[PDB]
C-alpha cells in the first residue's frame, strides 16, 4: 500500500506471559502502550505524554475482545498451535565506541514467535539484572515479533558482553558476543 | 456473548 506514513494499533493475547499487550506505533516506532496491570497509558517519549492523552480503557476493552476471539479460534482451529520460529539476535552500540565514554549496548531480537522470551545481559559472564531497559514485544508485518534490550555501559578494552536469549525454538540458549573492538 | 467480536478503533487526543 502506498503511504507517506503508517499508524498502527497492535495488540495480542496468548496463554503464556506476557498474556496481553496493547500498543500504538507510528512509522514502526512504539509511541505508547496501555499497561494492562496498572490500567494506564505509558508514553515512550515524555514530549508525547505532554502533548497527547489516550484512554487506557480502550486498550483494556480491545484486549478482552481479543481474549474472546482467542478462545473461539482455539476451538475452531482444533487447538492448532503454530511452530516455534527461532529468533535472530544482533548486538550493537547506540553511539560510536570511545573508551571511557558512556554508551548504550543494544540487543535486537528479531523474527521470532511466539512472543515468549528470556533475555539476559552478561558482563564478563555475570548477569546484569538492574538498570536494564527493554521494549515491548513489537509486532512485525509477518506477525512474528522483535524486541530491543538496552544496557548502559562504559567501554573498556578488557570487558566482554553477551546477550543471552532463550526461546522455545532454540535447542540451547543463544549467546551473541560483543566487545569494544567487535565490528 | 459473540463468538467473533470486532475490535473497536479509538483515537488519541490532545493532552488535558
Amino acid at each position: 500500500i502506498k503511504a507517506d506514513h503508517v499508524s498502527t494499533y497492535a495488540a495480542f493475547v496468548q496463554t503464556h506471559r506476557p498474556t496481553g499487550e496493547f500498543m500504538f506505533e507510528f512509522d514502526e516506532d512504539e509511541q505508547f502502550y496501555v499497561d494492562l496491570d496498572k490500567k494506564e497509558t505509558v508514553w515512550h517519549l515524555e514530549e508525547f505524554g505532554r502533548a497527547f492523552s489516550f484512554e487506557a480503557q480502550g486498550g483494556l476493552a480491545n484486549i478482552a475482545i481479543l481474549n474472546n476471539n482467542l478462545n473461539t479460534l482455539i476451538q475452531r482451529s482444533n487447538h492448532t498451535q503454530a511452530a516455534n520460529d527461532p529468533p535472530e539476535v544482533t548486538v550493537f552500540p547506540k553511539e560510536p565506541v570511545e573508551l571511557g565514554q558512556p554508551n548504550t549496548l543494544i540487543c535486537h531480537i528479531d523474527r521470532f514467535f511466539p512472543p515468549v522470551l528470556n533475555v539476559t545481559w552478561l558482563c564478563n559472564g555475570e548477569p546484569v539484572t538492574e538498570g536494564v531497559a527493554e521494549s515491548l514485544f513489537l509486532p512485525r508485518t509477518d506477525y512474528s515479533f522483535h524486541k530491543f534490550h538496552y544496557l548502559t555501559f562504559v567501554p573498556s578494552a578488557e570487558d566482554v558482553y553477551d546477550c543471552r536469549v532463550e526461546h522455545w525454538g532454540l535447542d540451547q540458549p543463544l549467546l551473541k558476543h560483543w566487545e569494544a573492538t567487535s565490528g | 456473548p459473540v463468538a467473533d467480536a470486532v475490535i473497536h478503533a479509538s483515537g488519541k487526543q490532545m493532552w488535558q
Partner: protein, 182 residues
C-alpha cells in the same frame, strides 16, 4: 517439549497518503491472518477458511460496516492530525563520526530522526561510489536511527576524505573531514 500456547493478534492500520486515509483491520490466529476489513473494499473479507463465519456475520451487521467505513475519517484522519503537529515535527540531528577500522574508513552517523538520510563519501573533492558499503538504516528502538557507511580506501599522504550527511533536521549539510596519515 514446547508448552501449550495459543496466540491471537489484532491490527488496526491507517495509511496516510496525499490527503487520504486507507484503513485496514486484521484478525490473526497465531501467525495466520484469517479475517480483514479494507476501507478500499468497504466490507470484511475472509483470508482463510477460519474467517468465513466472521466475515459472513460482520458483513450482515450494517452498524459494524458503517462504523468501519467511517474509521478513515473518524480515527485515522483524527490521529494523523495530532501526529502531524507533534510526531512529524520531531527532528533529531545526526551525529557524525569518522574513524579507521582491508583498510576501511567508517562514517558512523547516529541518533537521528527521521530515518531519511543521505550520506556521501568524498576523496579530495570527488564523490566516491565504489568501495562504499552502507549498512541499512538501523532502528535503535528509542525513536532514533543510526547508519554506518564504510569506504574502502588506499590512503596516501595528503589525501582528504570527507563524509557528508544531509537530513531534514539540518539547514546545511554536515561534513566531517579525515586527513590521511601514512
Amino acid at each position: 517439549a514446547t508448552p501449550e500456547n495459543y496466540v491471537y493478534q489484532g491490527r488496526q492500520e491507517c495509511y496516510a497518503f496525499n490527503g487520504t486515509q486507507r484503513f485496514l483491520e486484521r484478525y490473526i490466529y497465531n501467525r495466520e491472518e484469517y479475517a480483514r476489513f479494507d476501507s478500499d473494499v468497504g466490507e470484511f473479507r475472509a483470508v482463510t477458511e477460519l474467517g468465513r463465519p466472521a466475515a459472513e456475520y460482520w458483513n450482515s451487521q450494517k452498524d459494524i460496516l458503517e462504523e468501519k467505513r467511517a474509521v478513515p475519517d473518524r480515527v485515522c484522519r483524527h490521529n494523523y492530525e495530532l501526529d502531524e503537529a507533534v510526531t512529524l515535527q520531531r527532528r533529531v540531528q545526526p551525529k557524525v563520526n569518522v574513524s579507521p577500522s582491508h583498510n576501511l574508513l567508517v562514517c558512523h552517523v547516529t541518533d537521528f530522526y527521521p530515518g531519511s538520510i543521505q550520506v556521501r563519501w568524498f576523496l579530495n573533492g570527488q564523490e566516491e561510489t565504489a568501495g562504499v558499503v552502507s549498512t541499512n538504516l538501523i532502528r535503535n528502538g528509542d525513536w532514533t536511527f543510526q547508519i554506518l557507511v564504510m569506504l574502502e580506501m588506499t590512503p596516501q599522504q595528503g589525501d582528504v576524505y570527507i563524509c557528508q550527511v544531509e537530513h531534514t533536521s539540518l539547514d546545511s549539510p554536515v561534513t566531517v573531514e579525515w586527513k590521511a596519515t601514512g
